[PDB]
Amino acid sequence: KNFTLPVLRVSEMTNSRFPVVLDQMYTSRNENIIVQPQNGRCTTDGELLGTTTLQSVSICNFRGTMQAKLNEQPRYQLQLTNLDGSPIDPTDDMPAPLGTPDFQAMLYGVASQRSSRDNATRAHDAQIDTAGDTFAPKIGQVRFKSSSDDFDLHDPTKFTPIGVNVDDQHPFRQWSLPNYGGHLALNNHLAPAVTPLFPGEQILFFRSHIPSAGGHTDGAIDCLLPQEWIEHFYQEAAPSQSDIALVRFINPDTGRVLLEAKLHKQGFLTVAASGDHPIVMPTNGYFRFEAWVNPFYTLAP
Amino acid sequence: KNFTLPVLRVSEMTNSRFPVVLDQMYTSRNENIIVQPQNGRCTTDGELLGTTTLQSVSICNFRGTMQAKLNEQPRYQLQLTNLDGSPIDPTDDMPAPLGTPDFQAMLYGVASQRSSRDNATRAHDAQIDTAGDTFAPKIGQVRFKSSSDDFDLHDPTKFTPIGVNVDDQHPFRQWSLPNYGGHLALNNHLAPAVTPLFPGEQILFFRSHIPSAGGHTDGAIDCLLPQEWIEHFYQEAAPSQSDIALVRFINPDTGRVLLEAKLHKQGFLTVAASGDHPIVMPTNGYFRFEAWVNPFYTLAP
């Protein structure tokens, strides 16, 4: 069972941390930041981790029923299920339901309902502060704010994300994890933090720019693996013959290698690079597996 | 090379006609309807058809610029690009830009903006009538209605779909194609209509129930192939040995065959069934390719 990567171009792939297409590759040092995303987490042999779900359309989604309309904004209190409808097993080895956002922001989207008895429907804008005190998806408790009063108590309710809403009180901080159990509980069952552990290396990320309802923001969000790679590794389940798969970015227009990287079995890439900047490449380019290498392989810048 | 199918469960896959998870499999006679969807169209050897795009998150999206505000609803005039940013080439051998909706409805979502000069952002609800005379995505002309006046001219604008909005004047008609060129024009480069070609057979659909902002509607939308199968075929490009691949839905724990279907090389499935009803199958099963069969193969009911 040989290890392989999808052949898709960057522009043919999807961010694994928000439901949007990829725009570019990007590297950064992330000085003093703990890089520990919970979406887009999969080992090279196909073990999904954190809150990672298989369908990109489900990233940053919530599903459940409307438990209550409270007095204070955010007035609307959800009681969550898993996105497949199945109930929330609290003994589960996940930090929160699959698909839960893994960053702190005001998440902007639409809350929609369907009444089961007659299929009556309604939907309005909804915002969820993933840094807020009542944000406790682990225990199934999320609240959203909406300018509308047209919601039915107890109907099935879906939150579809659109983007963020940035203001001085609500920054978009992509590397700051929510407290999935609210501010009175510590996060658990987390996918591990990632960092380069070799001199002169930085993580190579796949970057998108997500919509915003407010602010002068580029909406940049960086994932460790395209969602399509996760789907592929889950299917292939190829064994790891070392801790590092050496991969080469090849331009099929020329047959030439333009970049070497290390694909770590834990599910992230590193390159020999310095600084925070995009990695510009021909658009038909894609990574190919080359070989499993030992732990001291040096990458050419 | 050999033909294969992904091993994903139905609940692990995505509709190819709207950016939502699959709910179930379903069959219908569709008597006296022309079933000719343009999204989710791909041959088994990986040739994309209609308006099919690879990223599920792009289905029913639009991208462009705010060209003008008009005096009458729908006031907001977009001039589209392709979803990648490139300009619309009327020459193209496509019925409309990749991802354009392939049904008549009031499509409900959010229009977001980011200014080119400095990334100033805003986003509000947007509704696009894909049955309206002025809906002409083929030539890049799409108007949306919004209750907000907080949109700015000549800024890059993205439409992210959420669902539909059904009322008496605006039904959701999943099998009625838009007039992609505007004002009752001539659709071209269409993926062909599909029908079973064999006694006792009906098409097997992968169904989702999409959100709605109004009306009594189940939101049902039936696709011919899960998006994950499309992306697999596109990358594998495996040849066919006949017009029909026998595929078997199996329980993975035991190997027991639960259902036989025909996967037609043109990109759709048939089963031996009659009526309009779900195809009830254990949640953990999946289809496996068995063999390319001749035209006389009869399926188990």
What is the three-state SS of A57-93?
Answer: HHCCCEEEEEEEECCCCCCEEEEEECCCCCCCCCCCC
Cβ atoms of B221 and B17 closer than 8 Å: yes
Could you tell me the domains of chain A?
Answer: 10-49+191-293 (2.40.510.10), 59-164 (2.40.30.120)
Q: CA neighbours within 13 Å on the CB side: how many for B168?
A: 0
φ/ψ of residue B146, rounded to 5: -150, 150
Looking at the partner chain, which of A84, A121, A215 has a beta carbon nearest the beta carbon of B217?
A: A121
Q: To what resolution in angstroms was this structure determined?
A: 1.4
Residues 53-92 of B with CB under 8 A from A: 54-58, 83-84
Residues 251-280 of B with CB under 8 A from A: none
Full strand arrangement of the beta sheet holding B120-129: A214-216, B120-129, B106-114, B156-164, B62-69, B76-81, B141-144
Closest Cα to residue B265, out of B243, B248, B282? B243
Between CA A137 and CA A159 the distance in angstroms is 13
Looking at the partner chain, which of A20, A55, A108 has a beta carbon nearest the beta carbon of B123?
A: A108
Q: How many CB pairs under 8 A join A and B?
A: 140
> A114: which chain B residues are within 8 Å (Cβ-Cβ)?
209, 211-212, 218-219
Between CA B108 and CA B164 the distance in angstroms is 5
Helix axes A227-236, B227-236, angle to 10 degrees: 80
Q: How far is CA B25 from the centre of its chain?
A: 15
φ/ψ of residue B70, rounded to 5: -95, 170
Q: How far is CA A50 from the centre of its chain?
A: 10
The nearest CA of chain B is from the CA of A218 a distance in Å of 6
Give the three-class secondary structure for A27.
Answer: strand
Any A CB within 8 A of B21 CB: yes
Distances (CA, A) of B281 to A45, A200, A273, B24, B226: 29, 53, 51, 9, 16
**Tokens representing residue B254 in the block:** 């035991």
Between CA B155 and CA B22 the distance in angstroms is 35
Between CA B59 and CA A62 the distance in angstroms is 20
Cβ atoms of B227 and B14 closer than 8 Å: yes
φ/ψ of residue B123, rounded to 5: -160, 140
Cross-chain Cβ contact B121/A14 below 8 Å: no
Between CA A132 and CA A59 the distance in angstroms is 19
Mutation target to probe the B interface, by most B beta carbons within 10 A, among A16, A17, A20, A162 is A162
Cross-chain Cβ contact A217/B84 below 8 Å: no
Tell me the helices (H) and strands (E) count for chain B, helix number first: 1, 14
Between CA A39 and CA A104 the distance in angstroms is 13
φ/ψ of residue B36, rounded to 5: -145, 60
Give the three-class secondary structure for B58.
Answer: helix
**CB crowding A100-109: b at 16 or more within 10 Å, else e:** bbbbbbbbbb
Closest Cα to residue B276, out of B102, B51, B31, B12? B31
How many residues are recorded in chain B?
Answer: 301
Place of tokens 């009830």: B280
Cross-chain Cβ contact B121/A19 below 8 Å: no
**Tokens representing residue B43 in the block:** 């041959």
Residues 193-232 of A with CB under 8 A from B: 209, 211-219, 228, 231
Closest Cα to residue B275, out of B22, B23, B26? B26
Q: CA neighbours within 13 Å on the CB side: how many for B51?
A: 31
Cβ atoms of B74 and B145 closer than 8 Å: yes
